[PDB]
Symmetry: C2
Subunit: 69 residues, 2 copies
Amino acid sequence: DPLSGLTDQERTLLGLLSEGLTNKQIADRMFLAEKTVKNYVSRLLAKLGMERRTQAAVFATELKRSRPP
Amino acid sequence: SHMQDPLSGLTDQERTLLGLLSEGLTNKQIADRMFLAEKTVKNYVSRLLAKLGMERRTQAAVFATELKR
């Protein structure tokens, strides 16, 4: 059984992408290197079957309202 | 007023651009749908973002998604 859903960091990453933060800004909030965030965004997009940041951001937005935490 | 259309001051074309941005489309994809050159859409996106007081594509797509609900 692979980790097919989102980890806690991936959920946070989704939320921060929806604020329009760049990888460097995200990294600054997560205490990570920018290259790590870039790699995490790539994995997250791949998992979700999307190619672009904006798609993930739109999916995050729709999720916040369709199924609030 | 506080009740004024959040899209106030955008042209019809900028509103459409906004709506298509929020579908996750590329400049080329938008251009194809709007019968515009891709470079023209790229310029319009920058002007749109200027108008919205935003720096990045993702921010526009999220704002539009929010408005759609």
